[PDB]
From a paper:
The XBB.1.5 variant of SARS-CoV-2 has rapidly achieved global dominance and exhibits a high growth advantage over previous variants. Preliminary reports suggest that the success of XBB.1.5 stems from mutations within its spike glycoprotein, causing immune evasion and enhanced receptor binding. In late 2022, a recombination occurred between Omicron sub-lineages BA.2.75 and BA.2.10.1 resulting in a new variant XBB.1 and its further sub-lineage XBB.1.5, the latter of which rapidly became the most dominantly sequenced lineage in the United States. We find that while the XBB.1.5 maintains a high binding affinity for human ACE2 as similar to previous variants, it has a diminished affinity for mouse ACE2, representing a departure from earlier SARS-CoV-2 variants.
To explore the structural basis of this binding enhancement, we performed cryo-EM studies of the complex formed between XBB.1.5 and hACE2. We observed a 3D class of this complex with full occupancy of hACE2 on the trimer, achieving a global reconstruction of this complex at 2.5 Å resolution using C3 symmetry. This is in contrast with our studies of previous SARS-CoV-2 variants, finding only one or two RBDs bound with varying density strengths corresponding to hACE2 (with samples prepared at identical spike:hACE2 molar ratios), and is consistent with the premise of enhanced hACE2 binding by the XBB.1.5 spike protein. Consistent with previous reports, we observed potent (nanomolar) binding of the XBB.1.5 RBD to hACE2.
Author numbering:
A (entry chain A): 14 to 23, 27 to 71, 78 to 143, 153 to 178, 187 to 249, 256 to 301
B (entry chain C): 302 to 620, 641 to 675, 691 to 696
C (entry chain F): 321 to 421
Write the structure that this text describes.
């Protein structure tokens, strides 16, 4: 039941100092720690995607590179998860992350994904994929898309483990990527062990009951992580409150 | 230390005191999400050997002890691994294959065997890594009129490959003429019934068999047997093993408020200084056990053979005992009088022989 | 070999009573499916002892050939089956065997 319904436009914005996450699960208090990891560089070019469905294939699959920074200002019900893999068909394994109002299901199977996958609302996954065979992983837990509010995620695929980091922020009367530091916290480490080179965002569409689906829009920001050395400031309570990118400018390099 | 039989008056550093570890603690996370072994070795209904049931086991803790204590077993033969090491090993996937056969055929569920069951119903490879478990099931699978719901494949064109299943009911064509679907001369239905009755001989009574096959792949192994989590002991020098992080030190109470996602703690110089207990969400200050430089304060051997021992940096309660800022001095008596320095101790304290006295 | 568990559990080695009637002829039964039984209204006599040895010789003969296919589960001729029980009846009646037990 694969149907093409979403069109997508793209613009370019500045990352500012968004995208910092905790590189490990180690408590450090009132220290300066220099770590080399896959980080989103400061003031980097981030692509802002607007996906519009009004009531042709114009929603291509994005590359994954070395990791993806995802942000959204939308409500928790419009964006409902993501798709990860290489070929996105029945010949290779793929990872499907689907959130709903009660829980999140993370599942790795051989999905035959649609070109324009979307969850239609009960909820049906027949517009996301046509078949799912040889399924090798399932993980159900509490959801990480809950309820103006900026939602930030960091996805990494390192040595068999898919790491997801998340943070929510009460933004207000400012550009969607605000100033200041909001360190993302480790949310899940998934023992997946698959090759991921491409990814795609999942949206939810409502049936119209009157142009089969209700018209809608979703805006999200995508940035790409790079191997970078960061210097993180840990305060008295162990929270990362500040960071300097070691290779951004000579002042920060001197600080590093 | 000085490689001489006569020691001149002074203080000499001779050894290093250490507090030996007394106990070992291996506290690990509260065991939960136990693999469903209570649903494979204890089902209300088993399967025929031709359509043998396979359950994949992943992302859980493998508590094989219930399997061990789940019935008296006619055979617990393990091919490739020893029955004990299982729990301390971690495999990627565990396949549990369940079926019912007759006692005489239990020997056929093994690598390198032949028969009706091995060739046409269930075949194990010659490099099989796993265990075979069988037990008697007269009270559950035998009826007096005859239990005709357990079937086996008697006729097949070719032998089965390892870990293969055939569910076909195709009429076995043993002759030259086509069968045409209808049973008739030289055309036999391949699935025959195991007519179990309670009065059969031991070799023919129904036996339930579960075959556990362990496989490792390139993926991270997520079926890791439960690691014993011993009780927690505080305020002593104990070898600690917390979530795979090992060391040796005292575990004192901590005032540090960790964030919910953090598990370990590190110093400015990247040395562990704190940890979170995985059984009870409390924070402990890991502090290494006391060590000190044992220094010996002695006058000349010409005058006397009395010695005093200074444990540098060690409080006196953790080893004529006097406490100094330099450390604990044993064998010298503090005198409130002040004299010139004869043997330097440190922090304003000096020692002399008059017995050996220590003074400011 | 020893005697099976089902032999001890299922055989009726004593006359059951007046209310339940049974054939009193000594007979060894090879039910099959590993089931071997003796129908014998045993009493206490030297005779019934020798006859019990005879019928257990019959049952041992039936047990040895059980592995064979169904239509060959018999004696090689009609004489062997009773001979292998009568040799036990011969050996058990000797003065040496009676002094041994
Ligand atoms: C939200 O997602 C959860 C998990 O996918 C759904 O809960 C499952 O519902 C199915 C019904 O087909 C049951 O078989 C499962 O046992 C349920 N799983 C759990 C963990 O509860 C739930 O129905 C979804 N809700 C909506 C509104 O779509
Ligand atoms: C972001 O990338 C686009 C095309 O890749 C480029 O035209 C644009 O100038 C970039 N933004 C900045 C701030 O350089
Ligand atoms: C994947 O599925 C197909 C049929 O569903 C099967 O032939 C193939 O062997 C399966 N591969 C694995 C690795 O399970
Ligand atoms: C991952 O997939 C891409 C695209 O198919 C392929 O080019 C690459 O070699 C793969 N990497 C590995 C390690 O298999
Ligand atoms: C740290 O914790 C203390 C005690 O709970 C709290 O008063 C303080 O606001 C927290 N934050 C900082 C930045 O000190
Ligand atoms: C195992 O089987 C016995 C059989 O009656 C039953 O009493 C018991 O509850 C079962 N245990 C489990 C854990 O299923
Ligand atoms: C660990 O198990 C014990 C025993 O049931 C329980 O009291 C304790 O609260 C558990 N801890 C956690 C973090 O669940
Ligand atoms: C069965 O025979 C063996 C010797 O082969 C003997 O040791 C054993 O006790 C016998 N069984 C019984 C129940 O007497």
């Amino acid at each position: 039941q694969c149907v093409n319904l979403i069109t997508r436009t793209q613009s370019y914005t500045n990352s500012f100092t968004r995208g910092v996450y905790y590189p490990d699960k180690v408590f450090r208090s009132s220290v300066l720690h220099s770590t080399q990891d896959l980080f989103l560089p400061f003031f980097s070019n981030v692509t802002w995607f607007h996906a519009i469905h009004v009531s042709r294939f114009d929603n291509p699959a994005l590359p994954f590179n070395d990791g993806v920074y995802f942000a959204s200002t939308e409500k928790s019900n419009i964006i409902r998860g993501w798709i990860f893999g290489t070929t996105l068909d029945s010949k290779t394994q793929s990872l499907l992350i689907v959130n709903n109002a009660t829980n999140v299901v993370i599942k790795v199977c051989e999905f035959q994904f649609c070109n324009d996958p979307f969850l239609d609302v009960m909820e049906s996954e027949f517009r996301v994929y046509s078949s799912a065979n040889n399924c090798t992983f399932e993980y159900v837990s509490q959801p990480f898309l809950m309820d103006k509010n900026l939602r930030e995620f960091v996805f990494k695929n390192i040595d068999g483990y898919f790491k997801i980091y998340s943070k929510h922020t009460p933004i207000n009367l400012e550009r969607d990527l605000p100033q200041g530091f909001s360190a993302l916290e480790p949310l899940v480490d998934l023992p997946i062990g698959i090759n991921i080179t491409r990814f795609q965002t999942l949206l939810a569409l409502h049936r119209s009951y009157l142009s089969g689906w209700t018209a809608g829009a979703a805006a999200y920001y995508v940035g790409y992580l790079q191997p970078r050395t960061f210097l993180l400031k840990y305060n008295e309570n162990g929270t990362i409150t500040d960071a300097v990118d070691c290779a951004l400018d000579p002042l920060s390099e001197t600080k590093c | 230390t000085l490689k001489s039989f006569t020691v001149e008056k002074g203080i000499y550093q001779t050894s290093n005191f250490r507090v030996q570890p007394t106990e070992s603690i291996v506290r690990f996370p509260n065991i939960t999400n136990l693999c469903p072994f209570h649903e494979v070795f204890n089902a209300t209904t088993f399967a025929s050997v031709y359509a043998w049931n396979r359950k994949r086991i992943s992302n859980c803790v493998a508590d094989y002890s219930v399997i061990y204590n789940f019935a008296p077993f006619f055979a617990f033969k393990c091919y490739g691994v020893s029955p004990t090491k299982l729990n301390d090993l971690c495999f990627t996937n565990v396949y549990a294959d369940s079926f019912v056969i007759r006692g005489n055929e239990v020997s056929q569920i093994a690598p390198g065997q032949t028969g009706n069951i091995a060739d046409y119903n269930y075949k194990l490879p010659d490099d099989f890594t796993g265990c075979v478990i069988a037990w008697n099931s007269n009270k559950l699978d035998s009826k007096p009129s005859g239990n005709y719901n357990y079937l086996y494949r008697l006729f097949r064109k070719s032998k089965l490959k390892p870990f293969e299943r055939d569910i076909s009911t195709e009429i076995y064509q043993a002759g030259n003429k086509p069968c045409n679907g209808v049973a008739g001369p030289n055309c036999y239905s391949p699935l025959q019934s195991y007519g179990f009755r309670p009065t059969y001989g031991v070799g023919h009574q129904p036996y339930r068999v579960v075959v556990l096959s362990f496989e490792l792949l390139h993926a991270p192994a997520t079926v890791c047997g439960p690691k014993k989590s011993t009780n927690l002991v505080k305020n002593k020098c104990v070898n600690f093993n917390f979530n795979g992080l090992t060391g040796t030190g005292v575990l004192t109470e901590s005032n540090k408020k960790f964030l919910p996602f953090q598990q370990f703690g590190r110093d400015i110089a990247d040395t562990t200084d704190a940890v979170r207990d995985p059984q009870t969400l409390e924070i402990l200050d890991i502090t290494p056990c006391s060590f000190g430089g044992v220094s010996v304060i002695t006058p000349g051997t010409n005058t006397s053979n009395q010695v005093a021992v200074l444990y540098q940096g060690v409080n006196c309660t953790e080893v004529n005992v006097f406490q100094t800022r330099a450390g604990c001095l044993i064998g010298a008596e503090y005198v409130n009088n002040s004299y010139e320095c004869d043997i330097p101790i440190g922090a304003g304290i000096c020692a002399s022989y008059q017995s050996i006295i220590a003074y400011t | 070999p020893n005697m099976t568990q089902g032999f001890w559990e299922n055989s009726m080695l004593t006359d059951p009573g007046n209310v339940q009637k049974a054939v009193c002829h000594p007979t060894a039964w090879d039910l099959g499916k590993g089931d071997f039984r003796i129908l014998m209204c045993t009493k206490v006599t030297m005779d019934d002892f020798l006859t019990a040895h005879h019928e257990m010789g019959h049952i041992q003969y039936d047990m040895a050939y059980a592995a064979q296919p169904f239509l060959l589960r018999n004696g090689a001729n009609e004489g062997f089956h009773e001979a292998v029980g009568e040799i036990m009846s011969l050996s058990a009646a000797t003065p040496k065997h009676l002094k041994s037990i």
